[PDB]
Amino acid sequence: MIVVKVGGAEGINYEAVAKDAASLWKEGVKLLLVHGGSAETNKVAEALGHPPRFLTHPGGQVSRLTDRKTLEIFEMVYCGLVNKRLVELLQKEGANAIGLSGLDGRLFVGRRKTAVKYVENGKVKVHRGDYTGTVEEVNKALLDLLLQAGYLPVLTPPALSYENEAINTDGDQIAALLATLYGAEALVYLSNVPGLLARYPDEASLVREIPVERIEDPEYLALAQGRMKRKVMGAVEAVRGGVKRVVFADARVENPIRRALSGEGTVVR
Amino acid sequence: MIVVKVGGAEGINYEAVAKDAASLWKEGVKLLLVHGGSAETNKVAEALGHPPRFLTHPGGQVSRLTDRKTLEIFEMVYCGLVNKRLVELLQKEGANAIGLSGLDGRLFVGRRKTAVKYVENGKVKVHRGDYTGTVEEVNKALLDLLLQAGYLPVLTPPALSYENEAINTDGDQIAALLATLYGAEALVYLSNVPGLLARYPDEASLVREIPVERIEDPEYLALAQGRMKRKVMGAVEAVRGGVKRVVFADARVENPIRRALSGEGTVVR
Ligand SMILES: Nc1ncnc2c1ncn2[C@@H]1O[C@H](COP(=O)(O)OP(=O)(O)O)[C@@H](O)[C@H]1O
């Protein structure tokens, strides 16, 4: 099992990712693809006159306000535009992809944050209509069933809350969760940069290797505390959880997945 | 097997349809739900600044121009907004729904019209970038597989062309095709009117029964040739194909499916 998380930032080469995934699948490789689409969602939300709004936490720590209308646009883009673009591209390449959201078959379920603190005009308030949460359970039976039948699952949020509400959630954590549940050989994170890097945006700052043995060393403190903490420690937890390696790699280049599997990027192990 | 086609016109009561479908499913009834969303697609397309455009055929006979950008908005709304709204609603009602498009698992495949004649300024032209076609094949194995595992499939176009291109297609024909493939006990068409009616919009013109024995009678010529020909003859072909009855019913009212199954509307047999 390989799990490939495709990021949703600008300049993701979907046709390049599709071409690679499809040829891996055709070679007999087990794949699970997870994707996003936050950039395209914003663009669509701008155009529909419902611009993105962000909650600044008492930290903080900013997170998208996923009100119902924002969630709906999230659904249009993640579940509609991107999911089906990716499925179509895969079918053109000879891979029988099947696109699913966390709502479908109760694939992804978790807890909704029903009261989130934020700071507006220097006063702290409580937002009760934010549809965001975690993923704590996966319908692995369904994924297993589709995998056994030979389909290539292409998965996306939103997830389903325990009260059956669609909720936004962290796509990187879904991918990490899937990778640990399946004991994945590799978990690949693709994005519009070459990998984890010390001086962003300089692409020669690329860190090649992060041994989980040495995660609490000062060398690797810089990243584990800096901008990309959530991803880095998610990877560390995944490897500890049984995933043999986690690779951060480039989604722009040709053969993004193959290069990543050959170690080109940041390898957490 | 019951197949319920939910229309995509204004004022479709999705929560009412969901409530009914879910309680039927919980009673052990086999359901396949097919839906659309042409009205909401138009509204979204208006707002995105890509207004609907129609091709007037040499007849004609008008049909939506489904250029790639229109197809993408079609995907956002049918596959994103509506499909997931419906799946969420079903999950809230205790039914384990699974939403799929024709692209997913190659569920719906057919032939694309790659050159459509139209009349513009009284001159006949040929449009070569229209992504519309038929559905000729269904991945019944996949549907069977999901049905056996107990999921409630919620299906939608677009379909996949034989050249692996996403294409718009007639949702009513998909539902008719599914109903004949499964030998459905009933095929229900739900829309924002009480049924097939002689003097539209007068709702007392409701035709209760159309015997397929008498389809070529002058009485039933009015409908079989009039505004709703494609639906009426699709129903007639379905019943001949082995479907025991086809009901045209109201999507607005409470218990829309149950009422339809009890004969409330236009019953083709
Ligand atoms: N300088 C940067 N270095 C690393 N990551 C970044 C940088 N700037 C933005 N990002 C990441 O890009 C992400 C876009 O979301 P992502 O998880 O890729 O897709 P989605 O949320 O659509 O699944 C942001 O959450 C952010 O963490």
Ligand SMILES: Nc1ncnc2c1ncn2[C@@H]1O[C@H](COP(=O)(O)OP(=O)(O)O)[C@@H](O)[C@H]1O
């Ligand atoms: N007066 C009318 N009587 C019957 N049907 C109508 C009338 N006016 C419009 N319609 C139907 O409403 C349909 C909307 O599309 P529909 O098939 O319900 O959903 P979708 O295309 O979204 O699956 C139109 O194709 C049209 O045939």
